[PDB]
């Protein structure tokens, strides 16, 4: 009764060996999620999910403890959206679709950001994708780290 599974192109068995583990082990900063995400023909949420699982499998394999901040780092936008949603509608959990705003944007709504992105420039590639480019104001840093009482 369990015999078939959707999406046969990527099997869980084959993702047990994590990809390019002999590289991003040795300098995990030079390896943002993008470089690896070009490997999978799936959508965004799925491939980031998979990358998280890779990191964890790798860690358990090498007998060291995994970065638990990693899921928060890859999903950072989703993290902050959930934090601010939780503060807005007063609840604890993860925001689901029914509770999204009903605003209807115009067709060309993204233009300003589009020309801002298209014309961006970066000194090195680390600046291009650092994990923290999501954050500008202090409110951003206060929402991103509220979890670790250390930070």
């Amino acid at each position: 009764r369990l015999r078939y599974e959707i999406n046969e192109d990527y099997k869980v068995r084959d993702e047990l060996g994590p990809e390019l583990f002999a590289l991003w082990s040795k300098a995990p900063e030079r390896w943002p999620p993008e470089r690896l995400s070009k490997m999978y023909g799936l959508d965004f949420t799925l491939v980031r999910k998979i990358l998280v699982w890779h990191h964890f499998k790798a860690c358990y394999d090498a007998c060291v403890e995994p970065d638990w901040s990693l899921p928060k780092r890859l999903f950072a936008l989703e993290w902050i959206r959930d934090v601010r949603a939780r503060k807005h509608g007063l609840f604890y959990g993860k925001m689901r679709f029914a509770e999204q705003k009903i605003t209807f944007y115009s067709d060309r709504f993204l233009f300003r950001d589009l020309v801002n992105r298209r014309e961006a420039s970066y000194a090195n590639v680390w600046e291009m994708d650092d994990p923290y480019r999501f954050l500008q104001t202090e409110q951003d840093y206060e929402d991103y780290w509220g979890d670790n009482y250390d930070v």
Partner: protein
């Protein structure tokens, strides 16, 4: 991105067209991923250096990383007296000639990447055409339900090329083994003994000896025989799918077929354009029997 993905789809499609082999989506994407990461590496190293564009005389100087980023601008006090508009245009044109030099560099780099990529495709591509069963017919020969009809004209103009020695197989592997046989033959000779003490010799041993790489040093530590993936003799993704679920089989073979068709259409478009440029073809269909009469 584009130039690569076109060639990779060429490979996948051709792989299924000529033999019944499917390439795993996993594999197809991981090729491209390797190209991408190559480019990324070249970027990493490209940002450590700077390119200097210069406008009028030397009195407008612009220092910019080849990626087009701007680091410094030096200017003569002469410039300061112009106009805001002309100052802007001047600096902008210096920046442009900087981006030009940088882009020249990068384009050499990219040519290099393309070469490495091709070299990595070669065991697959030459995997499919180097078999005793592989063949092609000319594109202008009619195809009918039994088989393919003979092109009539210029019985001199059709030459069938053959990639394989028809007598006993000599594979690329035998050639590499021949190369290291000659390496050792040269080294172990007296004249080679004296050569191995030269600077040329030690350059050769530093680049191309892997065997002497100390434990933990980057790079391959043995010399590798060239990969052999003979296409009709190696089952790849179709057998796993056929065992597991028929539906994914039909879908993946469908994808390969579609890609092959698409590639072929592209080749027809390029052919058509090259035919029009040289004036043998008109700009609208003038011959409709070549289409409607089937």
């Amino acid at each position: 991105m584009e130039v690569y993905r076109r060639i990779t789809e060429r490979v996948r499609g051709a792989l299924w067209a000529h033999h019944g082999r499917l390439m795993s989506e996993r594999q197809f994407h991981r090729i491209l991923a390797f190209v991408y990461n190559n480019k990324y590496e070249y970027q990493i190293r490209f940002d450590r250096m700077e390119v200097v564009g210069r406008e009028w005389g030397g009195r407008v100087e612009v220092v910019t990383t080849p990626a087009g980023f701007l680091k410094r601008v030096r200017v003569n006090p002469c410039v300061e007296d112009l106009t805001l508009y002309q100052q802007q245009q001047l600096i902008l044109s210096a920046y442009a000639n900087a981006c030009a030099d940088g882009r020249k560099l990068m384009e050499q780099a990219e040519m290099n990447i393309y070469k490495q990529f091709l070299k990595d495709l070669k065991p697959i591509v030459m995997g499919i055409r180097d078999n005793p069963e592989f063949y092609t017919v000319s594109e202008n020969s009619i195809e009918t339900i039994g088989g393919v009809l003979q092109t009539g004209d210029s019985n001199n103009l059709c030459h069938t090329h053959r990639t394989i020695p028809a007598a006993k197989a000599r594979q690329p592997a035998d050639e590499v083994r021949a190369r290291q046989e000659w390496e050792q033959k040269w080294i172990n000779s007296p004249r080679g003994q004296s050569w191995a003490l030269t600077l040329r010799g030690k350059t050769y041993f530093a680049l191309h000896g892997p065997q002497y790489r100390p434990r933990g040093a980057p790079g391959a530590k043995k010399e590798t025989l060239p990969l052999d993936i003979p296409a009709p003799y190696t089952a790849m993704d179709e057998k796993r799918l056929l065992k597991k679920n028929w539906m994914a089989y039909l879908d993946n073979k469908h994808v390969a077929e579609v890609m092959w068709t698409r590639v072929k259409i592209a080749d027809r478009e390029k052919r058509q354009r090259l035919l029009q440029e040289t004036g043998r073809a008109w700009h609208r269909p003038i011959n409709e029997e070549a289409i409607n009469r089937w």
